[PDB]
Design a protein around this ligand. Structure first.
Ligand SMILES: *[C@@H]1O[C@H](CO)[C@@H](O[C@@H]2O[C@H](CO)[C@@H](O[C@@H]3O[C@H](CO)[C@@H](O)[C@H](O[C@H]4O[C@H](CO)[C@@H](O)[C@H](O)[C@@H]4O)[C@@H]3O)[C@H](O)[C@H]2NC(C)=O)[C@H](O[C@@H]2O[C@@H](C)[C@@H](O)[C@@H](O)[C@@H]2O)[C@H]1NC(C)=O
Ligand SMILES: *[C@@H]1O[C@H](CO)[C@@H](O[C@@H]2O[C@H](CO)[C@@H](O[C@@H]3O[C@H](CO)[C@@H](O)[C@H](O)[C@@H]3O)[C@H](O)[C@H]2NC(C)=O)[C@H](O[C@@H]2O[C@@H](C)[C@@H](O)[C@@H](O)[C@@H]2O)[C@H]1NC(C)=O
Ligand SMILES: *[C@@H]1O[C@H](CO)[C@@H](O[C@@H]2O[C@H](CO)[C@@H](O[C@@H]3O[C@H](CO)[C@@H](O)[C@H](O)[C@@H]3O)[C@H](O)[C@H]2NC(C)=O)[C@H](O[C@@H]2O[C@@H](C)[C@@H](O)[C@@H](O)[C@@H]2O)[C@H]1NC(C)=O
Ligand SMILES: *[C@@H]1O[C@H](CO)[C@@H](O)[C@H](O)[C@H]1NC(C)=O
Ligand SMILES: [Ca+2]
Ligand SMILES: [Ca+2]
Ligand SMILES: [Ca+2]
Ligand SMILES: [Ca+2]
Ligand SMILES: [Mn+2]
Ligand SMILES: [Mn+2]
Ligand SMILES: [Mn+2]
Ligand SMILES: [Mn+2]
Lengths: 242, 250, 242, 250
């Protein structure tokens, strides 16, 4: 007995009513979702935080039956950094409760308030982290991480940013294997990165979540980068028994 | 460059935050979308009026390119009347300005305010109409209508209500033919009906539209019927559909 | 446990190896599947017979579990008759056993051998009949028909031929309702026909069936028309414990 | 103006005529496609090679229009080895011309006849390689690799085999960026591997190609492992795929 919800934005459009935008999020004339503040020149600013949600909650689990949804989302994104040596803070795909407020900037990625684990967050996220928060146990490498009610990622893998180049991303969740899987590929320069782990979405998330993007820039001048999104598809399936 | 927005409600849930319940519209505990009001008794009430819309506007055409969405939807619904001789007024699947407010009850079907045509409605519907308003040029028989900016359907055809029986609808809009088609089947009765006509969606809708059901029961006590929706499926693409593949399992 | 097989021919190409063509059927330069003989000049010929099948069998029902496929097919076809008053014989979408040869021409539609019902035809069809075979209890009008192990339709509805316009067809089988529905629209005329009936696929087909088209022109001189298909899409779904 | 062709085998079934079996490929009565010979015990035999292709050719590209197909494919497979430390040879998913004979075994994986690259193979493969063949430039570790007309990969990455555990694979081709990607995840060990390269196909493969799997065991006793496939979906679009939807509908 399956519900499904899916959409594909191959462009973005100014003021799109199917998209909830938060903090600094703009969608440009040219169709770019500009998650984080970027002046006329292309020049990203500090002290920024931006978010994008799909306008309707996704039913990721069902308490009557205990059935859990599988989902798959795909997106393409570009991090340009004026200076690659100083980069902060990163972007992320997440699933948080609905009407849940944006949270601290920088390392927090606009999804947390603190280094502390808290089951209250009810956030699961795949981060693309570009600055090392030693305070958070970040690997020293810029990384893909999987967060579960904590910015202190449960598992991380290296990810070598290709500055200004477009990354194609696939994020997967098999509900019967409880497997969350994230893969990033640079089409131009042909590199590849994968991270996978087990997350039991029912003990973590509410039945209904907002899905979308979060992004932050550095708390320090020069520690700046864009977080531009070009396209985004998603598809979730919630079957009620076998 | 193709956008797609799409979904399946095969079962409904109370309070479902991805739909916008308006008027009396609710979803019971066992999953039925009651568009229009029903006592626990199971007795349908008069002067009810309810709508359900998907909470996400749909991009139906793009002004910059001129490009227009194709779309498909299907659902399963029952109208049950305690008294088949006194049945009012109907239900409808529609597109309208985001997220439109319900308009007059009764034979207006929550979609219109009078018998006259008006472009500001910006509304296009397929009605499944159950009471003959002669001031709306209604045919004597129960009928499926296509309606554009008016309650006076621009084309109707016969529909024989099977009282208390689930009908399966496929409504369909091929953008290159500007073709709207509504098919209705009762699998229990083996009976079927189709209406087909053109409507140039770009002429009559805004770029963004809210999609849903609308239903009303009668303006006099006893003209009464349910307008229950069991399941619902929708799919659109806008390029700046694969229908076979869409039904066989949406 | 759901298997699925699906495709779309948005146009045909000559000797494309995923169709098997039988009889006179061929694919033209401009990508048309002419089921029946049309000459040099567009003049269709009599005594012609053509079938075009998907080169893969379709698992219609599973005997071990007794479950049965749902499937949906859509196609676009033109028949054009140079004399509207003298047209024959029709076309058909059908399911039948594999390596099951073409069968009698004319009014049997490449699908049968006599008037009589016969179980061992193991054939199910939706037909688009342009000539009254009185001998087959044909209605006195061009009709659409459901046929199950007989050219004697188990049900019909009136179909109004629109000479030389493309017809859009949607045929659909719902194995939970055991419900076969055929709809035909002409975009040009705005016209619309539907036929709906119960058919037990599990009763009348084997587990695997070829799926395709059959068509035939009239017997006598003059009872001629074309039977041209432009596009075809099929999808089926066979869940073992649904 | 877009063609399509997809399927999903969640089970395999004995004899299944939409699947063409070559060499030793057997489908177990419990549903496993056994690419290479697996005896009574369940003990894999050496000296084996098997292949299973989809029974109909796939249109990968069109010469008239020069347009080229995109495609996803996923599958579950298990390699079981009685001694983890004597293992050969490997399995692959390939695209070769119809109706390609199966070719040399062992480290050639049933796809190639020798170390030599050849254009007239018109074979592209994603390889799962379990034995180092120095004659083919194999890296010291077990690896996934992209093969184009040759048993010598154009690129590889360390694949660490988890013995007896189902691997889930995703293979994609983006014709728009001539880019082929293989990824494998062992859901039990939460462990993963991904491999990206550019390969044209228009220049390398015919318009029509058969597709499936190929496998082989070692050339000497004891160098043995199974190559068992549990499910398989495939999707191809060629305009003259929405992967996110593909995966979650398998
Ligand atoms: C529904 O479908 C089946 C087809 O599967 C028909 O049954 C078959 O009919 C054929 C043709 O009549 C029979 O073949 C016969 O088999 C015997 C040996 O078993 C042959 O020798 C025989 O030939 C003799 O007759 C010939 C013509 O008279 C000569 O040329 C030969 O010399 C030879 O002397 C012929 O090939 C099948 O055996 C029969 N199959 C089965 C499984 O029964 C149905 O036909 C009906 O039933 C038949 C028994 C027969 O009596 C027909 O007259 C019936 O139509 C067919 N049913 C209907 C209603 O059409
Ligand atoms: C579409 O619906 C709109 C809004 O309902 C119609 O506009 C209304 O039309 C009436 C004209 O018959 C107007 O009557 C007036 O009432 C006011 C006081 O409230 C008086 O001061 C005035 O003397 C009129 O009698 C009404 O004003 C008007 N409402 C609004 C909000 O403008 C509309 O009718 C069409 O446009 C309007 C503005 C007039 O020009 C009409 O003549 C015209 O037909 C509806 N359109 C159609 C095509 O039916
Ligand atoms: C790469 O792949 C091509 C195509 O298979 C190879 O060419 C083929 O080689 C075969 C010999 O190994 C040729 O077949 C023989 O033809 C003669 C003449 O009738 C027969 O008497 C004999 O018994 C064989 O059937 C085959 O003709 C040829 N195929 C084609 C399509 O031309 C190719 O091998 C190289 O080219 C040929 C001309 C011979 O010189 C070979 O020795 C040769 O290596 C393969 N390339 C390599 C480097 O291995
Ligand atoms: C978690 O969050 C809530 C409010 O958001 C707070 O009351 C609580 O103290 C939190 N921290 C921990 C460690 O539980
Ligand atoms: Ca960090
Ligand atoms: Ca009415
Ligand atoms: Ca006839
Ligand atoms: Ca090797
Ligand atoms: Mn981190
Ligand atoms: Mn009406
Ligand atoms: Mn007939
Ligand atoms: Mn290798």
């Amino acid at each position: 007995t399956t519900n499904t919800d899916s959409f594909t934005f191959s462009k973005f459009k100014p003021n799109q009513p199917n998209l909830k935008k938060q903090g600094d999020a703009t969608v440009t004339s040219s169709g770019t979702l500009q998650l984080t503040k970027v002046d006329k020149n292309g020049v990203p600013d500090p002290k920024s935080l931006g978010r994008a949600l799909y306008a309707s909650p996704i039913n990721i689990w069902d308490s009557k039956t205990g059935v859990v949804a599988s989902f798959a989302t795909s997106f393409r994104f570009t991090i340009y950094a004026p200076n690659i040596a100083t980069i902060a803070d990163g972007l992320a795909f997440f699933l948080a409760p609905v009407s849940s407020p944006p949270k601290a900037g920088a390392g927090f990625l606009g999804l947390f308030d603190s280094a502390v684990f808290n089951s209250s967050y009810q956030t699961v996220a795949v981060e693309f982290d570009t600055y090392e928060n030693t305070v958070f146990l970040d690997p020293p490498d810029t990384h893909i991480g999987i967060d579960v009610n904590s910015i202190k990622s449960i598992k991380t893998v290296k990810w070598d940013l290709a500055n200004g180049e477009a990354a194609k991303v696939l994020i997967t969740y098999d509900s019967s294997a409880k497997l969350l899987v994230a893969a990033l590929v640079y089409p131009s320069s042909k590199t590849s990165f994968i991270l996978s782990d087990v997350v039991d979405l029912k003990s973590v998330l509410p039945e209904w979540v907002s899905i979308g993007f979060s992004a932050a820039t550095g708390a320090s001048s020069g520690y700046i980068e864009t977080h531009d999104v070009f396209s985004w598809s998603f598809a979730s399936k919630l079957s009620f028994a076998a």
